[PDB]
Amino acid sequence: MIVLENHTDISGKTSERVLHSAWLNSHYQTGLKNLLDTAVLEGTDEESARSLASRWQKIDEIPFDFERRRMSVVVAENTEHHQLVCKGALQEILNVCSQVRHNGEIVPLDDIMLRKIKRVTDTLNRQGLRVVAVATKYLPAREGDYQRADESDLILEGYIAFLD
């Protein structure tokens, strides 16, 4: 059984924000149902899941494909603003992130941040954990569809890690 073991900020410290973001993607994505998303849904408390599902309505998705290997959902708690939530393997997510959330601030994903991310995720991998990175973008509402090109200038939130 694949089990959600970790949900962390980029430094590897436990984060509810990261779990909740991952949950929303796992709950609302329809492009590629999978055992990792099932583990996220199983590893989230029912109270949190109920609150998230109720508050955040599904707006759109940017379904998984096998070339870019990311998937996004867009959700909204009110009409005026959209939250895009993207997840995938680390490198594919890093490719479309320009920012990172670090100690309650959104800052550039610069060389010092990348070194921290490399260290934490290399450590997770060496321990036998499967790592999925989670990134977001907060947007004004749009009338049109979301597209693959919208996965850009994302904010890396952290990672979810799984153990078999």
Gap between the Cα atoms of 100 and 112, Å rounded: 11
Range of the domain at 96: 1-164
Q: How many domains does the chain have?
A: 1
Q: How far apart are CA 152 and CA 154, in angstroms?
A: 5
The CATH number assigned to the domain holding 87 equals: 3.40.1110.10
Please state whether beta strands 3-8 and 154-163 pair in parallel, antiparallel, or not at all (unpaired).
Answer: antiparallel
Instruction: Tell me the torsion sign for CA atoms 42, 47, 51, 54.
Output: positive
Contact 163, 3 (CB under 8 A): yes
Q: Which two tokens stand for residue 85?
A: 């939530």
What is the residue whose two structure tokens read 């990672």?
159
Q: What is the resolution of this structure in A?
A: 1.6
**Residue 120 structure tokens:** 């934490």
Token pair listed for 48:
């949190």
Dihedral in degrees, nearest 10, Cα atoms 46, 55, 15, 89: 100
User: Which residues are bridge partners to 81 per DSSP?
Assistant: 140
